[PDB]
Symmetry: C3
Subunit: 263 residues, 3 copies
Amino acid sequence: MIGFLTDWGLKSHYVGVAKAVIKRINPSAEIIDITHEVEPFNVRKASHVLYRASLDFPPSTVFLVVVDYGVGTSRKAIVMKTKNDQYFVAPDNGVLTVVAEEYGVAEIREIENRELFYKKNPSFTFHGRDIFAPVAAHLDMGLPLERVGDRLLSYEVLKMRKPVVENEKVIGEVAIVDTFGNVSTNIPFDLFLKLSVDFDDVVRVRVGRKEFKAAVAKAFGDVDTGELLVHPDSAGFLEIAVNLGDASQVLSVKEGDEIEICR
Amino acid sequence: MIGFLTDWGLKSHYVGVAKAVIKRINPSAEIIDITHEVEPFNVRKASHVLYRASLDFPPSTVFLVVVDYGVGTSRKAIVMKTKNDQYFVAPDNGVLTVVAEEYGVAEIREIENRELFYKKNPSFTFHGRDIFAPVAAHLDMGLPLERVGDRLLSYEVLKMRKPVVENEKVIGEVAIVDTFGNVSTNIPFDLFLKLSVDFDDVVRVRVGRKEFKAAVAKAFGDVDTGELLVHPDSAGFLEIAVNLGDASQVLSVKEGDEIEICR
Amino acid sequence: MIGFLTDWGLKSHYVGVAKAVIKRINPSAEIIDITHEVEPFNVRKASHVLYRASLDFPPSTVFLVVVDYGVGTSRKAIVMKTKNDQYFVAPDNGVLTVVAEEYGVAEIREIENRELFYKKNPSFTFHGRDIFAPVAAHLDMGLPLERVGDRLLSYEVLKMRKPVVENEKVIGEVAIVDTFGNVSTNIPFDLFLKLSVDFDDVVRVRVGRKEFKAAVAKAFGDVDTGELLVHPDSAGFLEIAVNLGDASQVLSVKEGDEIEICR
Ligand SMILES: Nc1ncnc2c1ncn2[C@@H]1O[C@H](CO)[C@@H](O)[C@H]1O
Ligand SMILES: Nc1ncnc2c1ncn2[C@@H]1O[C@H](CO)[C@@H](O)[C@H]1O
Ligand SMILES: Nc1ncnc2c1ncn2[C@@H]1O[C@H](CO)[C@@H](O)[C@H]1O
């Protein structure tokens, strides 16, 4: 199957024409949308969503990742194969930073084989359709990785500050605010569990000049409605939520904001 | 096929990872999205959308319904088989109230068979992925209903006031406001047709302290642009619309608001 | 495959029930969404999106186009076969104006064969589900075009002013503003290239009483961030964009607005 992720939105016909290209190459391709609502040009956001979503895709899944503000420039077009046997077709702009780091990379190929393109003359601003999508289609059909082009020994990396436990607390950043307003961080719940806390315990959440108390819970329903809670989200990351409410609003925080969890 | 309905939104990667789980279990599963834009935690809204959409799905369709604010709590996870031979995989929070009432229930099973789960250790807040979705996948693949777990003799019901015809009028509630602003009620068009009215007749619509006149019509185009009309929507429910306009705005009404249709 | 385009939105269960009808008729149907976010009743917008998207669909693709404010009225329901061998199932309201003009029409059939319908008694306001969708399904399954109904010798056309090159400049209109804010016109990039301009050249963009200078470029990245550029979009149309910005905001323009490109 193909894991599809972009910042194109579902309003435009872009996603659709990309899917038609894939289907023309391989009518049996299974295209699963991770999301096409990554904020415009937000590769950082895509890098996290990509990793988190990939955890539930099987090995040998071909990911088509296109948040590519540098489309048509000298930036490289690449295919990365990670050590957990997954493949990623994307621009070399750092969007594959998280999967590379978390999974480790087995090999990287630069997209050079023009026989794999949709059109002999690729448009300058829509490689998603003319290059990436058709390459993902071929790979998902069984094209050997080496037929993509030459190997690359390096790739662009996005700078990321690794969250740590210092002085009974863990400092991190808001990685993703979902539609419910839940606030997921880049702080692994295992790391948090190093402050020697446990479910039913109460901790402190510091955002900006604000400080809140919050129960460590398993389910939203574990606290009264409207109350705050700290818990492991579906991907193993520490998330702050308001039971039947919007934590992003209560905390008044946005993606990228620094967050501190104190015992 | 699988009818998929949630309040997760399409912006998050949630819908996607759920679909990947289904596809991993059964690559041939046909997943049709009813909608993933039910307002957060709005089971009432989902219960109506579910019923209305189910009318066009064939018998033996497996519905995956996940608007589950009580995820991870003692609330039961169930599979309901209705008398029209459709199946519903959902939380026992009343979201299956309308199909149960309208179709009648043949049997209910509590989800207990852990061999049907996606993960041996289900996350606390995303049973949609770890329990419901994989159970729907197995059922759609032909798993006998009894393999799901033990039978249940009752289920949670949402309180709903049945609309009636009293004194040349029918009182009801706004069930769904669609993207055009059309205002669909919970009033069956057949019931309305008891006030001895007919197409081309004019009736009165009362909302709040407001009263409007509206023609009973078949098509929006049956009245001048901007005019109000009362008609049967695609599911047989009385709906109020503005031809080439937004009735929710003109009436200034929202879902749940009481509505009165007077001869 | 079936190219699906409507103004129904993805929030409602409408798109879903239409897809279930198609799948019931032909479980092997490949439904590719072009977009369901065309503004309500905006056939003009749909006519352009349709054409632009069709360029990447293969010949023999069956397009299901339903932006039908006149649903249930005397307006005809038709199937148009163009000279590039594509088929379009739609209301005869002018939504097929652009493909007809650009591709030329080989034949038009009025939908008359009721054996092709979803329901013996079609709803008055949702022919998308009861007539169009099932007809598209049958055609995609191989139903000969003549079985649809009698031939029609004419069809509704939307009035459109053809952009031209007069006095070193080209006047046109904004056809589509995408999610990035890019401003695509109805001006073919080939026509623009008649003003004897070339990449790296600078031209003038006139909107309203405003005038801007903009570089003619290939990729957004070809200019500094925040700068304006004129380039050919993925469909060959002249588009104005802001590198890593929103041109619709900078120009303060909307679809339908007249635009002038001066040497
Ligand atoms: N105005 C723009 N400036 C820079 N990049 C853009 C712009 N519009 C679209 N893109 C990029 O084009 C890519 C698709 O080819 C998208 O991933 C998007 O990030
Ligand atoms: N902050 C929250 N409070 C209560 N329930 C939530 C919250 N966020 C998500 N959910 C529920 O989690 C379910 C998916 O596991 C969704 O159906 C949603 O209703
Ligand atoms: N209030 C309305 N007035 C006119 N047309 C409408 C209205 N609501 C929905 N439609 C049309 O119904 C069609 C689907 O049957 C849509 O394409 C839409 O354009």
